[PDB]
Amino acid sequence: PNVSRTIARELKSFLLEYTDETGRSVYGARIRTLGEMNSESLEVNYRHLAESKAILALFLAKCPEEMLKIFDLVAMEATELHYPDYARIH
Amino acid sequence: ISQFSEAYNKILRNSSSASSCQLVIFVSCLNIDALCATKMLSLLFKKQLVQSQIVPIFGYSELRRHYSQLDDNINSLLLVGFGGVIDLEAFLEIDPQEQSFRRDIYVLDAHRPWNLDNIFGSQIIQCFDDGTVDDTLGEEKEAYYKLLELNDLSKRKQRKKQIHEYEGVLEEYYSQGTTVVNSISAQIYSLLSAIGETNLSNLWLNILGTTSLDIAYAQVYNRLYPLLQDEVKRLTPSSRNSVKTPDTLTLNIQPDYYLFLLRHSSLYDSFYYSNYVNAKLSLWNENGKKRLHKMFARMGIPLSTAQETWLYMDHSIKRELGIIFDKNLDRYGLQDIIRDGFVRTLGYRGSISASEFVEALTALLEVGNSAQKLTNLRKRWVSNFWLSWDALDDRKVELLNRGIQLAQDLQRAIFNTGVAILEKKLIKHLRIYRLCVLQDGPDLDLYRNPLTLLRLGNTLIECCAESEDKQLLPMVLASIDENTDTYLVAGLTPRYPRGTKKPILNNFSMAFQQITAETDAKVRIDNFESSIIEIRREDLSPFLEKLTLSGLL
């Protein structure tokens, strides 16, 4: 659904400026890691996603299928703003 | 102290005869500049078909074996890179024979200051001092016309006070660092343009000459670009390509890189081994190695595409090679990489960067080849010299590549071992200056050659100082394998990070001669350069202590 697009607008906020252990965004450092390693697997902890909101965690136990497709395109957006490239990588 | 064209006509009149000729031009020694010079020189001789001998001298002590042994009919002699420091009039002696002296030894040198006994008191020279330091140079000028030939008690006291008055300022001179003003090649070309030869490969020899030393400073070279680029403008193979065409097909300006072996090696290995970039990015560190990959993540260049040889990389990356670097390198502080360089294209073979060619020749000089052993080794270097001489020729490219497959390997050695040092933090900051010694390492065979330690010493003095506050401090290195504790120790000069205010004038030349004149403990100036000497492990430690004090800087 188109409403789900708005969900992206939220999860991107979870993707970069989310912090833990006194500053130092973890997912920013994962995107930086690959990133340099360019191993094309971005890694998101379920603990944190569930910590921010249980509504998305509930979406993971209901309908992961199309939501991962919604999600990873946004991850590609975050990598795009952090490394203005990888149009040529994967 | 003469017109180049007129010194030329002199060496013409004493030359051609029956039997021809005779002259021995001494190519010396291990400095690529020498080749660059003497090759265009030798080609110039072949033009008028003047017979010549050409000798590969290594040791400065070795020259005595030659000049004292074989000379018969030779009325006109030529020498290269020697004598600017130590005078050969006393060293060879001479013993004036027959004014209008029969033999004229031309001495070509880039080194300063000239020996005092050389320029004034004309016997063997016919000096090449022109035109770099003319100057004045009034300090050497008052050194003689005053000194020579030099109520009466006050006039004697006055006279002697004047004598020491000149001797002090004179002592300031000739005790000083040895620093190249301009590449001898450049001047041979200045001599060459007056005769009227514009030849392309000649000019390439000049480019080679100038770019021989950019590994070490410029220093004037930063302003040598006019004197080359204008000449590149004084000729042109075709107004427009006309691809390729298979002939002429010549050198051209391209955005070249201090980056190492871009065209003949894989890109990633080309950053990872490059000398300027070793430093700024902390590549010996595993934590910094990643920062390179971040560079590639910034460029959008695949890691797999970085691993692949440069001939075969995609075309898009080639067309973007001059852009992407602008977009990215600026952010890493690596903004000084892009030079305006010279590249000669042989067409269907490939192209070659002016600098990389020099990396090939240097590569040739050490590899790809009790007194009996050192003589035999220096001999092996003498033979190897010609293996390197041949690569300059255009018609044989097949062995030039044998240089490059070496030039890569050497770095793979040098870098490796270089890192082997920084892991143990072997640098001794001391007080007055920085110092190091390699007590152990892999494959010291490569490190036998003076120039190998010139390049390792270079990547290391480049690595330790970015800068990297504070106080660029000259570095010392040592290595030993065989020949019973020869422990070769070369002097070095500090590297400014592209912002160079002063030449800084390497002082090890003086500091070593002070020790040879003190206890002289197994100290050997046998190598042609004043910065590099030999030592024994027995006497190296007291030598190091006598090196520490008294510090001349």
From Swiss-Prot, chain A:
Homology family: Belongs to the MCM family.
Top-level taxon: Eukaryota
Further details from the record: Present with 1690 molecules/cell in log phase SD medium.
Subcellular localization: Nucleus
The protein's name in its UniProt record: DNA replication licensing factor MCM2
Function: Acts as a component of the MCM2-7 complex (MCM complex) which is the putative replicative helicase essential for 'once per cell cycle' DNA replication initiation and elongation in eukaryotic cells. The active ATPase sites in the MCM2-7 ring are formed through the interaction surfaces of two neighboring subunits such that a critical structure of a conserved arginine finger motif is provided in trans relative to the ATP-binding site of the Walker A box of the adjacent subunit.
Subunit structure: Component of the MCM2-7 complex. The complex forms a toroidal hexameric ring with the proposed subunit order MCM2-MCM6-MCM4-MCM7-MCM3-MCM5; loaded onto DNA, forms a head-head double hexamer.
Gene: MCM2
Curated annotation (Swiss-Prot), chain B:
Record keywords, A-Z: Cell cycle, DNA replication, Nucleus, Phosphoprotein
Record localization: Nucleus
GO cellular component: CMG complex; DNA replication preinitiation complex; nuclear replication fork; nucleus
A Gene Ontology BP annotation from the UniProt entry: double-strand break repair via break-induced replication
InterPro entries per record: CDC45
One Pfam family matching this protein: CDC45
Superkingdom of the organism of origin: Eukaryota
GO molecular function: chromatin binding; DNA replication origin binding; single-stranded DNA binding
Function, as annotated: Required for initiation of chromosomal DNA replication. Acts at the origin of replication. Also has a role in minichromosome maintenance.
Note: Present with 1730 molecules/cell in log phase SD medium.
Cited PANTHER family: CDC45-RELATED PROTEIN, CELL DIVISION CONTROL PROTEIN 45 HOMOLOG
Membership in a protein family: Belongs to the CDC45 family.
Quaternary organization: Assembles into a complex with MCM5/CDC46. Interacts with MCM10.
Name this polypeptide is given: Cell division control protein 45
Species the sequence originates in: Saccharomyces cerevisiae (strain ATCC 204508 / S288c) (Baker's yeast)
Gene: CDC45
